[PDB]
Symmetry: D3
Subunit: 306 residues, 6 copies
C-alpha cells in the first residue's frame, strides 16, 4: 500500500463535518495547510491516546483539485451530479474541501477543527458545519440501527480504497456527503410495522425482513446493488445524527466512501429515480437532502508531500 | 428532608441548556409537563444506567411564577438585574423556564430535550439552546481548569439548597445563567503569565496564585466573598464550553446555583461594577455576556404534586 | 443500629436464584451457614472489587422460621397465598431458604453459590436454581425496559426496610419470588402498539403512556397502588430473564422486596383477580407463574448471631 | 483470500454451545439458515459494539455434510473416533451442526441462539446446550489458568486454517468438542503441589514446571506433540466452565480447533491410550467425557453462497 | 458538624507514603502548609475527576503536636511504643508528619507529593518514602488477598473516627504505620497448606479456615480481638506492596486506622509478645518491621482553620 | 522472522532493568534467554487483554562476544561517550537490558521478579527504574512526549533490521540514557522560553513554525534527513521516574532504531552541536547519568538457544 487516511476508523461517537470553499487567492494557504493536517491531527490527538481515537479525513472537490494541483486527476473525480427525480431531488451544493473529523468525544473534534480553521482564516469561506453524535445503541434519528451491513476488514479495504485501476491515486477513496433533514412528525405517525416496511429491517431487533415480505421500494432493497460479476457492490457509511430541538431540526448527515463514485451514484439513482418495480426509496418521503457534494480523499502520503 | 432536583450532579461531560418563554394560553401545557418531567428523566435515562448520569434541573422565572402558581413566592425570586457598569454590561434577557440537562453523552441530553419540547410544542417559544461539551482536562475555552473550587458534600448542600429561612421552598435553589462569548484572538495574544494574572490561578498546574501576587482585579479575587461571620460565601458552578468554528463563536455558558441569589448577585456586582481597589474583573475584557436570567429550581416534590 | 443485607444493590447483570428446603435434622447445619454467609460473600467477592459487585441476600420462609428460631417472628411473615383467579392462578410452591446472588458476572455468582451449597450438602434439598442474565439495555424477555420506576435513595429505604413498626426486625425486608414462563410465539404475534397496551409504556423509548390512552388492564395500571393517604405504595424489583433455547423456555424470574408483604400481595391480587374495570393483568395472557414463595430477609446483624 | 469465520476470536467471557441433529426432511430449512447466519450475527451484535464481541462459528458433521451438499468433501472430515482406553473412554455422541457462540455477556449469546433456533424449529433435534462462563482470572473449574499456551497471530492462523493442502476448503477449520464433568471432591482433596503435578504448571503463578520435574503423565506433557519435521503441533482451544450447583455438576466444555483433525486426534490418543512412559493423562482421573463430536467449520463465503 | 479527612477512601491502586521530621525552626512553614493541603489536593486532583480518586490524609506525631499547637492534645496521642518480644521486635522510628497519598494512578500521587514537599523543603527532613502498588487481585507480596475483613460503611465510621469520647477532636483518627520487609525465599519454601496455616485463610479462594483447624498462632487468630462487651474490635487497613527486584526488597507497607490507638496496640502486643497459647504471630517469621510510628489525623476543618 | 515486541501499544508503566553478567554466569543467562517469552506469557496471559505486558530483551556488545560465537550484528558496539564543550554523554556498564512494559506496574514487577529469580548469582544489577506515565503523556518538564514517533509501517521500517544485515533481520538497536532534570532551574523560565527550548507549544503540543523555532531547540536538533531527502526516524518510549524526598525528577530515555547510526547522529547533534547551534538547550536542564547500547534480537533467535 501507500498509506491511506483513516477512512476505516473504529467506531466513534462524535463527529464534526466541515465543508468550505476556497476564496480566490486562497490556494497557497490551503496547500500549506494540507501538508500539515496530519501533524495537527497528532498534536491534538496524541495526548488523548488511546481512548480519544481522533482522526481527520480530508477531501478535495473536483473544481478545487484543478485549482490546487499541477498534473493528473483521479479518474472518478467530477462534481456531484444533481438528480431530478419525478418526486424527490438530490441537490448539488458547493464544497471544495471536506474535513471529516471523528473521535470518542466532541471536544477533540472541536479542538482539531479550531486549529485547521485557524490556519485557513481569510482563505476559505465556511459552507456547512455539523456536530454529530451517535445514539447509544447505534441508532439514527428515525430510531433504526444504522451501520449494520457495513463491510468489515478486508472486504471494507477492497470496497473503499483505490488500487491498481488508478495507481497514481492508490490508497485514496471517494466520499459523497448529503445533509438530510427529517419530517419526524410524519414518521412518528406511522406504526412500527409501516416504518419497518420503509427501511426493510425490524426496528427493535435489527433483523432483515425476509425476501418474501421486504418491499421493493424499501431503503434496503433499493441500496442493494449487484455488479456485472454477480457479487454485491458495497460502500462504507458513517451516518451521524445531528440537530437542534428549538428549531425542530432532526437530521442525518450521510457520508459514504467507495473506491469509485459509480457505486454510490448508482445507489443514489435507484433511490431518487427509482427502478422498474419502485418509484423511489420510501425513506425520501421522510427525508429531504439539503446538501450534496463529492470529494476525493487522497492517500496520506500524497498530502504530506506538497 | 424534601427531595431536591439533581442540582448536585456528578461531573458530566455534556449538557443542553434550554431557555424558553411561555406563550399566552400555554400555562396549562407547561403545568402538565412540569408534573411529568421527573418521569421523563427516568424514561430516557434508566436504560443507559449507570454510565449515562442523565439529569434535568427545571427552573422557573419570576414573571412566569406569577402566571403559573398562586400562593407563596420563593423569597429571593425576582427578575435578573441588569448591571450597567462603567465599561462592561451584564444584560437581562427574557426567560420563563430553564431546562439544565446533563449527562455523560450528548445523545441522552438530546433525547430528553426532544421529549420535553415535544410536549411543549405550541405553548412556548425558544429563546436559547446551547449544546455544551467539556474539554478533556475539565478545561474551559480559555484553557484553564474550571470548577476546582466548587464546594462538595455537606458544604455544597449548605451553599445551594434553601432551608429553614424559607421553609415552604426548602430543597430548592436559585440558578443564574449567562451566555458568554470570548475574544480568543485577544486572549491568545497574552503570555501565559499574563493570563494567569487575569484568572488568579496557574494555568498548567491549577495552583492558586499566592495572596502577595494575585491581583485585586483577577477573577478569583473578585469572586471571593466573605459573609458577616468571616466564612466564605460559596456557589456551585457547572460552566460548559460551546461554540461553532465556522462562525468563530467560542463560548462559556455560565450557570451558578446558590441558596439565595444575593451571593451570586454580589459576585456579579464586583465583577461588572468594580470595587474601590478593582475597576472590574479582567476576565470581562475577553468575555461578553449576551444573555442573563434568574430562575428558581424547586424541590422535586413541589413539581410532582401540582 | 442495624445493618441491612444488600437488598438495595447497584445494577447487576447476572444473578443466581437458589431456593431450597431444609431436610429433617438439617437445622443446625443451616444455622451454622447462616452465621457465616456474609463472610463467604466477602471471601469470594473482595478480590474481584470494585467491578464484581457480588452480593448475596438470604431469606427465610415462614415454616422454616419456626424450625430454626424461637421467640419473636417478623410480623408479616406467612406462607405465600395461592391466588385462584377466574382465568389465571398464582401457585404457592415449597421453599425454606432463598439465596439471591447478584454480580456483574455469572462466574462470581456461581463461585459463591458453590461455597454455600458446599456447606449445606446433606442438610437441604434444592427446589429451584435459575441463572439469570439481563439484556444489554436493561430489557427483559418481552423486549421492554424493566426496572424504570423502581424507587431509589431514601424512597427505596422507606419502601423496602422494616422500621419502627416491628423494631426487633428493623433493617429486614420481605421478598416475594415467582418464576414466570412466557409464550414468546404468542407475544411476538402482537404489533408493537398492542404490546405497549399490555405493558403501559412505549417499547423503544420507555415513556409511560398518558392516562387518557393507558388501558386499565395494562401491567403498569394494575401495579400502581395508592395507600389510604393518597401516596404511592412502592416495591423494589430486580426481575431477571432466564432460559434454555433447546427446551423452548423463555422466562422472567420475578423478585420483589417490600417493607411489608401487604403491598406486594395487593399488587398480585389486582393482577390475578382483577378490579372493577379490569378482569386481570394482560401480561398474564403471555406469562405463567410456575413457582411462588415468600421470605423474610433479616438484617445482616441478625444472621451474624 | 477467502474470509474465515471468527475462529480466532478475542478473549470472551461467555459462550453458548449448541449441538443439534437434522431431522428427516430438515435439510432445506438448514441450508436457508446457514446462508443467513452471518447476517443474524451482525443483526444481534452490531448494536452492542464495540464491547459485545459477539460471534458465531458454525460447524457441520461428516454425515450431515453428505445430506446438505454435493460435490467435494473436506479431506479430513469423518465421524469422531471413539477411544476405548484401558481405564478411560472418549465417547462419540451424535451431532450434525455445531453453533459455538461467544460474547462478552451471556445475554448476547442467548439472543443469537434464540434467533438461530427460531429458524430451525421443526427441522432439528437438540442434543446439547451448554451455557459457559469464564472465571475472572481466566481460570477453569479446576482452578488453573486455561488458555496460556494457545498460539496467537500468524502462528494461530497457520495452526487452525485449512490452506493449500485442500484448496477448495481453504479458510475452514476442524473443531472437536467434548463435554467433561469433574469430580471436584476428589480434586480438592489433593494438595496444590499434587494438582500442579497433574497439570504440569504452577497453580498461582501459571509458570510451567521445568522439564526435569514435570511428570510424563501430566496434561501438558502428554498434549505437547512434535511433528515429523521437529516443529510443535498446535491447536486453538477455548475451554469453558459450566455447571449447576443444585445438581452437583461442575464441568469443562472442551473445544479445540485445528487445520487438520489428525493433530487433535493425536493429542486425544496420548491422553486416553497413553504412551510408552505414561498410562494416561492424569487429568482424566478427575474428568469424565460424556459427549464427543467432530465438525468442519467452513469459510464464511462458503456459507454465504448457498 | 465536623468533616473528616478521606480516611475511608474507596479502593485505590497506587499510594505514596511520606514520613518526615520537622527541623528546628520549621514549625511556621509546616503550619502554613497544613492549612493549604486540602487546596493542593483539589488543585492536583480536580482535573482528573472522577476517575483519579486522589486524596491525602495528613497525620501529626505526638512530639510534633506539642511543637505546632497549644491547647488540647487528642487523648490517645503518644509516641509509638517499641515492643521488645522474646524473638521479634517492633521498632519505633522518628516521624513528625505523615502524608498518606492515594489515587487510581501513581502520577497523581507523585504530583501532589511534589507540591507538598516543594512548600516544605528547608523545613522538614524526609525519613521514609514508599511508592506502593496493588498486586493482582488485591494480593500482597505473600500471595494472599489483603483487606478482606476490613469494616465497611457504618461499621467502618464507628471503628475509625473519634467521636463523643474526645469531642474537641471528633472526626479525627489515629494511624499506625510499619514498613515490613519479607523473606520471600523462606516463604516460598513452604507448601501452600503451610502458608495457609501461617495466615489463617485459604490462599486461592480467600476462605477463612474453620475454628476446628485454624492455628492459635496464625495471623488471623492473633489479630481477632473481642472487647469486654463481647463485640469485635476492628481497624481499617490499607496495606500496600512495594519493592525493588535488584535489591531483593519485597515489602508490605502496613497502615492501620482506628478511633483509639489501644485497639491497634493490642493487636500488635498479641503479634509480637504472644498469648498463653501462641508465642508470636507466625507471619513475623517471614516479615521484619523496619519502621514504626503513630500519628493523629485531625478532622479536615481543624487543618483549614490555622 | 518474528521480532520482539519493540512496537508496543502505549503502556502506562515500565520497569527498566540493566544488569552485568558475572564471571561464569553465561550459561545461566543463555538458559533464561530461551525461556523469557514463556515467562512473559505465564505472567501476562491471565490479565489479557488489558494487561499489555511485554518484555524486550537486549544484549550489549561485550556480552554478545561472551555468550555467542560466529557472526555479530553489523552495528553492535559499546555506547560512544560524547565529550562536548559543555555537556557530556557518559557510557556506563550494561550487558543485558530488560525493557518491561504494561498497563499496570504489578505485571511489570511480577515478570521482573521471575527473570531476576532465574538469574540470581549470575548477574549484578546496575540500574532499576520504575517508570510511570504522567498525566496526558507528559514528561517531567511538562511537555507531551511521544507525539512525533512513527507509527505503523513507517515505524516497522525505522526500527527493524532487514536485508542490510540479513542474518539478524527482525532485530533492533536500543539506546538508553537515564536523565535527571534540574526542575528549579527549568521552572524559573517562562512558558514561552520553555517552548523555545523544546520547539513545540506547551499546552497544545503544536510544533512552532519554522520561522520561530530556534536552531538549538530539541526538535530542531533531533530532526535529521538522510542523503535522499527522507526523514531518519527512531521510536522512543521515554518514561518519567523519580523520588520526591531526594528531589530526583527524571526522564528515562529509550530509543529504538534499525541501525545505531541514526540514534548516534541525533546524540552528536545534541551534545556536540552544529554549525548554527552550540548544543541542545534541553541539556541545560537535563544531565545524563547512564548510557548503554543494546541489540534486541528477533524473538526466534532467543527461542532457539
Ligand atoms: C436519510 C438518509 C439515510 C438514512 C437515515 C439511512 C438509514 C439506513 C438504515 C437504518 C440502514 C439499515 C441498517 C444498515 O445496514 O446500516 C441503511 C442501510 C443502507 N443505506 Fe442508508 N440511510 C440513508 C441514506 C442512504 C444513502 C443516501 C445511501 C446511498 C447513497 C444509503 C445506503 C445505504 C446502504 C448501501 C445500506 C445497506 C443496504 C444493505 O446492503 O443491507 N443510505 N441505511
Ligand atoms: C466567562 C465567564 C467565566 C469563566 C471562563 C470562568 C472561569 C473560571 C475559572 C477558570 C475559575 C478558577 C477555577 C475554579 O475554581 O473554577 C473560576 C472560579 C470562579 N468563578 Fe468563574 N468564570 C466565569 C464566570 C463567572 C461568573 C459570572 C461568576 C459569578 C457570578 C463566577 C464565579 C466564580 C467563582 C465563585 C469562582 C471560585 C473562586 C474561588 O473561591 O476561588 N465565574 N471561574
Ligand atoms: C478435561 C478438561 C480440560 C481441562 C480442564 C484442560 C485444562 C488445561 C490447562 C489448565 C492447561 C494449561 C494452560 C494452557 O491452557 O496452556 C491446558 C493445556 C492444554 N490442553 Fe488442556 N484441558 C482439558 C482437555 C484437553 C483436551 C481434551 C486436549 C486435546 C484434545 C487439551 C489440549 C491442551 C493443550 C494442547 C494444551 C497446551 C499444552 C502446551 O503447553 O503446549 N486439553 N489444558
Ligand atoms: C533528556 C530527556 C529528553 C526529553 C525530556 C525529551 C523530550 C522530548 C519532547 C517533549 C519532544 C517533543 C514531542 C515528541 O515528538 O515526542 C521530543 C521529541 C524528540 N526527541 Fe526527545 N527528549 C529527550 C531526549 C532525547 C534524546 C536523547 C533523543 C535522541 C537521541 C531524542 C530524540 C527526539 C526525537 C527524534 C524527537 C522527535 C523530533 C521530531 O521530528 O519532531 N530525545 N523529545
Ligand atoms: Mg534539609
Ligand atoms: Mg533543585
Ligand atoms: O445509510
Ligand atoms: O466560574
Ligand atoms: O415487574
Ligand atoms: O486445554
Ligand atoms: O493486615
Ligand atoms: O525524546
Amino acid at each position: 500500500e501507500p498509506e491511506p487516511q483513516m477512512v476505516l476508523s473504529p467506531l466513534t461517537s462524535a463527529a464534526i463535518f466541515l465543508v468550505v470553499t476556497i476564496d480566490s487567492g486562497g490556494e497557497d494557504t490551503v496547500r500549506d495547510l494540507l501538508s500539515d493536517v496530519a501533524s495537527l491531527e497528532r498534536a491534538v490527538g496524541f495526548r488523548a491516546q488511546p481512548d480519544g481515537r481522533l482522526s481527520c479525513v480530508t477531501g478535495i472537490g473536483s473544481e478545487a483539485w484543478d485549482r490546487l494541483f499541477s498534473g493528473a486527476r483521479p479518474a472518478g473525480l467530477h462534481p456531484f451530479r444533481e438528480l431530478d427525480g419525478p418526486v424527490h431531488r438530490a441537490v448539488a451544493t458547493p464544497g471544495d474541501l471536506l474535513f471529516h473529523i471523528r473521535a470518542s468525544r466532541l471536544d477533540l473534534c472541536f479542538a482539531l477543527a479550531t486549529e485547521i480553521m485557524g490556519r485557513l482564516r481569510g482563505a476559505v469561506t465556511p459552507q456547512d458545519e455539523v456536530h454529530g453524535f451517535k445514539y447509544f445503541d447505534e441508532r439514527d434519528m428515525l430510531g433504526f440501527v444504522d451501520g449494520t451491513e457495513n463491510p468489515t476488514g478486508a472486504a471494507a479495504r477492497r470496497a473503499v480504497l483505490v488500487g491498481a485501476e488508478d495507481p497514481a491515486f492508490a490508497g485514496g477513496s471517494y466520499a459523497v456527503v448529503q445533509k438530510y433533514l427529517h419530517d419526524i412528525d410524519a414518521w412518528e405517525g406511522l406504526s412500527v410495522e409501516a416504518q419497518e416496511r420503509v427501511i426493510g429491517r425490524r426496528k427493535m431487533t435489527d433483523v432483515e425482513l425476509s425476501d418474501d415480505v421486504k418491499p421493493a421500494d424499501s431503503h434496503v432493497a433499493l441500496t442493494s446493488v449487484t455488479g456485472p460479476d454477480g457479487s454485491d457492490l458495497e460502500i462504507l457509511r458513517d451516518n451521524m445524527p445531528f440537530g437542534s430541538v428549538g428549531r425542530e431540526e432532526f437530521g442525518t448527515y450521510f457520508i459514504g466512501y467507495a473506491r469509485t463514485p459509480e457505486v454510490t451514484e448508482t445507489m443514489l439513482e435507484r433511490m431518487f429515480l427509482g427502478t422498474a418495480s419502485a418509484p423511489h426509496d420510501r425513506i425520501l418521503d421522510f427525508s429531504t437532502a439539503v446538501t450534496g457534494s463529492l470529494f476525493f480523499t487522497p492517500a496520506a502520503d500524497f498530502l504530506e508531500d506538497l
